[PDB]
Design a protein around this ligand. Structure first.
Ligand SMILES: [Ca+2]
Ligand SMILES: [Ca+2]
Ligand SMILES: [Ca+2]
Ligand SMILES: [Ca+2]
Ligand SMILES: [Ca+2]
Ligand SMILES: [Ca+2]
Ligand SMILES: [Ca+2]
Ligand SMILES: [Ca+2]
Ligand SMILES: [Ca+2]
Lengths: 501, 447, 447
């Protein structure tokens, strides 16, 4: 009521139940504050820095920090944290390249025809954050690199995916050259960014890429010829953060981010969202199970995602800038330990939904947004119209399903897809009669036909198909049916890139 | 009602309404203070630095900051922001071959930047050659707004430091093939001046790099290039969703007037005698601003760009036309007009050109520049809606299209390009079915 | 009253009116203090530093600053400003080739500059060979106003460091070998000023003159004096135009010059160091803006005197003391004395005019005339009846012959001519008059 234990200008009762800031003072939360646009903050009443970041709970809630720090970081539970990596555009030994942020996380994914009781996401043995990057050359026509030189400097640009700017960027990178490192070069004096705001780059887009200049044998040369692609990853990044001064000015000297990385990473649970092009990474505070004096509030996976990514709760489904990021509209990726945790906690849950599982310290999450996703209700970004679409029903996963009686076919041009990229075609199937059968057929570089048996209730199936060539045969999807089948939430998502000779 | 939530020497009741500075004391603004020479200031009552610059609201309003900061930036909403770049003037290539460049720093912002240390790039075609940061002998001690280093009347400084090391053949062959070199800056390091505890101005620990992100993030960008000069401004704007953000809301026209200290002639806006009003200038918006303005105009009946609320993230470019006539006192076209009609009483501003038939106008290219695009714009009105408006374009490419007249004046813009100094003249003929009303016909230079 | 708004130890009522410092205590000015040698100071009551320089108004009025700072700076409206620039005495080329230069630093400002370290450019035509900054052993520890480093009577210091500087290649020095020379221009200069700390010692370490250059240049108005051998540059503060809260006092050009150069006033005439600097005695050179504003302010004035125009910030003035001046009263330095001159009149500018005896013509050789640079013939003309015509013919590189109609009042004419060629012949100047014309103040000034 009036006690302030941790001394962060927030009373214990308000910080335990829920508080909000009005006129730069904390007031007790009431449900009538919702329509005005306010938000309900809750944090630990024993720690002044709940999230692990340099700024306290009051400094985050009241927004008395840099006006560059994202509003999703002013939540007392979401850390203000820079995730800075280095990407390679051109290399000097000769042509342009291309890179993907969430690439190493998707190489080690195996997708089965069916799923298990309740569990929906996939499992990956290699969960590398958005900082680790691998390239993918495009201008190559398949010829050897020896054409022109026959042998017997690079252009890069830093990027930030976190919720805080980082001043004085001094990253450290390895010239791995696909398994055999040569030198751990560092950005000495000409390659430091004065500042790098979130969702931005140095040098900023529209400017020429930065070049580091201040030795390649035929092994990695023939590896590049054979199909291997060059990789650039950053071991560490050295930067600074901004805080006020006694005179009222901002200082970023002596305030390093390297003093808070080990503290932040050991308290939070990492969540990654990839929307095809824009990649994000957030750390959300979590409670240690053993300690009885740990007062970090408990939130579910859905609440954690909504707080971290500032999604809009339009009814009951999460929306991110209009894109549905609900667990039934995306494909979640876990690691081994998070998979075990979710699987064991789903057995005690009647709802059997991932987004209703309590967030636990040490989790790793990766949300992969499908490239084309339709639900037959209001959202359809598919380039074409599915054959024999039925919508006169109320028995869909959200609003209405598709009365699959016969066959449904879609056409997908090769140009609208990307070459040498593995894809996953997934959706929901159900047959109340539990008597009909479903078989699917695709045509690609390899033609594969798969069959499945629907169950009484909604279950999610997933099938793997790949694409090759920039301009080649298109992709055709056929859903052959015998009786009446209900289909909903059908989508295709972009997984890692398959190599070629 | 003398509360001070932000603690910046201005009571919040004075910030919510108007206020002004008298004898270094903030007082409530009165309607009769305008004729004496004062101004009305409004600012957020929850931030002490409304615009994100290192100077508070009281310091900016009362003029208690560096005296080289333009009064253009003494309003609490206009951020004191030094916008600085580097431009080349000539190339010194000599022989391996070593690269030497003569450059001159430029400033377009509203604040002076002490100890300028730019970082540039050497680019010929995509492939970046080297990144050069001014080390010791090419650091500008002072750079006032709208000035250079070295000052006008002094030869440019030479940048030949790590010394430049291109390869012997590839770059030389590429340049000789018909290519040129680019020197684009990525960042810059400079200081700002604050009076310390005992009154001495110190610029040693005061960096502009701690405020760049904040100023960029709490404000919106507005640019004015007059053809001879260019100006860069940032004006604070309020967050949409946040209910605890108390930044005042202003329109686009008021934002321009604040950001450039223009004098308002009732409705006309003048910078230095050059008109600024929306009809007399061409506004170039990016995508997000285009959709924002269109959507918010769909909800308004005024149909005026300058009456649109200014919010965060919008980019506006105001390109002052070079060839512009209003049939009252403005005439700068290369050739004399034809079939003029100065007798009118219902014109856009004072009178309108009641053109009957067609207009034969030619454009001598000697008064024109090559390899640059142009547009021609004006206001067309035809209550009868029975005349056909068509234009023929003689240029590098031939194009002719029709126009649909409307009851009221509507702007029309068509793009064309002229290349080659050793070419022929450029002629565009205006043709109409009969008596038509046209006003503010103008031509503006583009990229 | 003891009201002190800016807290600089002078009450506001004393700053608005006159004041003076007695026993280190500011007292109200009385008209009888002029006999004792006291001076009437005025300043702005809303500013602790009225001129923008590091020393406050109480530190400047009372002389509580460095004793090397000239007494012209003690006026609170005259800024203490060091204007320094690297000279050149020798250019040694050492052949592959090497460049050696003997430079000597000059100071024409008002306050000394400590730890002088200028930045200079090596240019010959357009292009810049290199920019060099005095690194460690070419730094002036002390540079008092109107003094040099090395001091007079000492040899100039060598300047040969940067690896090392050489001519670029074999394809560029042919421009020098063809009859062209390299020049030295100072882009900027860095130094520190002196303040007295708590212990009473003087420290010049944390200080920096580069902190107050923009402020002083943007607040004050530049005035430059020339005396043929030495030149002086001063900055005098002035108030803004549309600002009601700018309390800087307004002064005309006359007392601005008197304050800036400490000229002694003998009733009406103004002598700097025995050389008259009145409006008629010398000639003034302006830029476009200052000339325009001076003329516009003057056309409201019946007195029609330049020294009566209110001084405004942004005004640049250059004063050139004539070299060949004669007023038919007490001085005539022309090598060839004027012919047909009578000294019996009563309508002169100050004492007596010249009774022209018809035709006057004089021949001046080039023994005392500097070649290759233009000169200006100036004087006063008037005709009570306007019954005569005055024509002038000058023998020079080009045949110069012009005519003028004298007015009824004292009008000052200015005719220019260029004496090109080092070994030019004897220049002939002729003036033709129809009858007897009363003239005064004939002047020839080098440009
Ligand atoms: Ca607390
Ligand atoms: Ca707390
Ligand atoms: Ca549905
Ligand atoms: Ca306030
Ligand atoms: Ca405020
Ligand atoms: Ca008109
Ligand atoms: Ca005072
Ligand atoms: Ca004062
Ligand atoms: Ca006389």
């Amino acid at each position: 009521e009036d006690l302030d234990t941790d001394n962060d200008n927030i009373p214990d009762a308000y910080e335990k139940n829920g508080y909000t800031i009005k006129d730069s003072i904390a007031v007790k939360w009431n449900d009538s504050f919702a329509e005005q646009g306010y938000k309900k903050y809750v944090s630990s009443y024993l720690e002044s820095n709940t999230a692990g970041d340099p700024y306290t709970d009051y400094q985050k809630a009241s927004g008395s920090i840099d006006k560059a720090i994202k509003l999703e970081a002013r939540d007392p539970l979401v850390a203000a944290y820079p995730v800075v990596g280095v990407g390679m555009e051109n290399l000097i030994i000769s042509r342009a390249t291309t890179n993907s942020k969430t690439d190493a996380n998707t190489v080690g994914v195996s997708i089965s025809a069916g799923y298990q009781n309740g569990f929906t996401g996939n499992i990956t043995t290699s969960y590398s954050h958005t900082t680790d990057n691998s390239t993918a050359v495009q201008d190559s026509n398949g010829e050897s690199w020896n054409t022109g030189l026959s042998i017997n400097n690079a252009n890069v640009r830093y990027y930030n995916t976190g919720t805080a700017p980082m001043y004085k960027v001094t990253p450290t990178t390895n010239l791995v050259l696909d398994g055999e490192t040569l030198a751990t070069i560092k950005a000495q004096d000409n390659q430091i960014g004065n500042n790098l705001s979130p969702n931005e780059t140095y040098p900023k887009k529209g400017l020429s890429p930065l070049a580091l200049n201040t030795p390649i044998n035929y092994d990695q040369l023939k590896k590049l010829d054979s199909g291997k692609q060059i990789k650039l990853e950053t071991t560490q990044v050295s930067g600074n953060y901004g805080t006020k001064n006694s005179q009222g000015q901002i200082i970023t000297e002596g305030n390093s981010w390297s003093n808070y990385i080990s503290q932040i990473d050991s308290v939070s649970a990492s969540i990654i969202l990839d929307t095809g092009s824009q990649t994000f990474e957030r750390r959300v505070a979590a409670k240690e199970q053993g300690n009885p004096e740990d007062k970090t509030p408990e939130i579910t996976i859905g609440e954690a995602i909504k707080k971290a990514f500032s999604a809009t709760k339009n009814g009951e489904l999460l929306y991110f800038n209009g894109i549905p990021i609900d667990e039934s509209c995306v494909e979640l990726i876990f690691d081994d330990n998070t998979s075990e945790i979710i699987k064991e906690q789903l057995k005690y849950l009647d709802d059997k939904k991932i987004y209703n599982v309590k967030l636990e310290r040490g989790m790793n999450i990766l949300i992969k947004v499908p490239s084309y996703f339709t639900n037959f209700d209001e959202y359809n970004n598919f380039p074409a119209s599915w054959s024999n679409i039925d919508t006169k029903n109320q028995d869909g996963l959200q609003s209405v399903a598709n009365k699959l009686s016969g066959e449904t076919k879609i056409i997908i041009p090769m140009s609208k897809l990307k070459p040498y990229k593995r894809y996953v075609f997934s959706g929901y199937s159900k047959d109340p009669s539990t008597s009909n059968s479903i078989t699917v057929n695709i045509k690609s570089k390899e033609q594969k036909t798969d069959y499945l048996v629907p169950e009484k209730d909604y279950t999610k199936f997933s099938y793997e198909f790949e694409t090759t060539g920039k301009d080649s045969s298109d992709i055709e999807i056929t859903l052959t049916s015998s009786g009446v089948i209900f289909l909903d939430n059908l989508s295709i998502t972009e997984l890692n890139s398959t190599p070629e000779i």
